[PDB]
Amino acid sequence: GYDYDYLFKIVLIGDSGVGKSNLLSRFTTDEFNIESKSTIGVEFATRTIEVENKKIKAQIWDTAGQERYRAITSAYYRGAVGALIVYDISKSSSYENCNHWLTELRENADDNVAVGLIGNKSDLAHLRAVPTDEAKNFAMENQMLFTETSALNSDNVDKAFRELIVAIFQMVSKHQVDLSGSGTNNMGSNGAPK
Amino acid sequence: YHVEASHTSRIIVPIKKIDYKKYNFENTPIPRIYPGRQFIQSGLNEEQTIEMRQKF
């Protein structure tokens, strides 16, 4: 059937050409029967983990920037609870508007979100457009999880997703107690009197 | 020499040249005092890097 317990939606946001979609395909189920990207914009991918003996279903919506869909993207951040700003260390002008993406996403997403920040294409570490310690600091006074992804090793990004779903889980972890259902008696022949 | 309170005195120091086939002046440029650091892109043209190396 379906049988999962919770379902989160997590946007991937950034500038175009920073390498979000190639980052998405390697670590998660992909190319199921999705028509494509740009036909409607913002492709959807799914990931199924379990936390604390609860099953979690996560939908990742890699936002697409083409200027034409800018009005459409606003409506797609409505209700968005998990977030990931991706930036590349090779090019440098994405980091000038990474703060703008954070501002636009603090606006009209939820009451509270948990935004990660991830450096794609660390295979070109020598070509470092921005120092990692500055982005690490900018994550530190913005309450953000910070990652550096090789794009050739998927362990880092997979670890980031597991910890992000943990922090967003405890945030919404509704209290649960028990569903045991063992209390049985009263098998008589009913000498009733009304 | 003698310089009193404002009087400049241009010292004329004679030296020789240097030989371009004796020293290489295209070696690792502007060496850092301590090794390591961020290792960010230079952000300058290779030709500019040549003249900055010579002028240092």
Answer for the pair B9, B1: CB distance below 8 angstroms, yes or no: yes
| A157 burial type by CB count under 10 A (0-12 exposed, 13-18 middle, 19+ buried) | buried
B41 vs A128, A132, A133: nearest CB: A128
CA–CA distance, B46 with A75 (Å, rounded to integer):
46
Furthest C-alpha separation in chain B: 50
A36 found inside a domain: yes
A192 found inside a domain: no
Q: How far is A150 from chain B (nearest CA, A)?
A: 17
Tell me, what amino acid is at A49? I
Q: B7 by DSSP, 3-state: which?
A: coil
Q: Which residues contact A38 (CB under 8 A, 6 or more apart)?
A: A64, A66
A64 found inside a domain: yes
A193 found inside a domain: no
Q: What is the resolution of this structure in A?
A: 3.8
Q: CATH number for the domain including A158?
A: 3.40.50.300
Q: How many domains does chain A have?
A: 1
CA–CA distance, A97 with A105 (Å, rounded to integer):
12
A99 found inside a domain: yes
- Residue A71 is encoded by which pair of tokens? 């009005």
- Rg for chain B, CA atoms, rounded: 19
Torsions phi, psi of B41, nearest 5? -65, 145
For the beta sheet containing A114-120, the strands, ordered from the edge strand earlier in sequence to the opposite edge, are A43-51, A54-62, A6-13, A82-88, A114-120, A145-148
Q: A146 by DSSP, 3-state: which?
A: strand
Q: A20-27 and A155-172 are packed helices; what angle lies between their axes, rounded to 10 degrees? A: 80
Q: Structural domain of residue A30, as residue ranges?
A: 6-172
Best interface-test mutation with B: which of A128, A133, A136, A148 has the largest number of B CBs within 10 A? A128
Distances (CA, A) of A99 to A118, A169, B36: 13, 25, 28
The answer to whether A15 is a known ligand-binding residue is yes
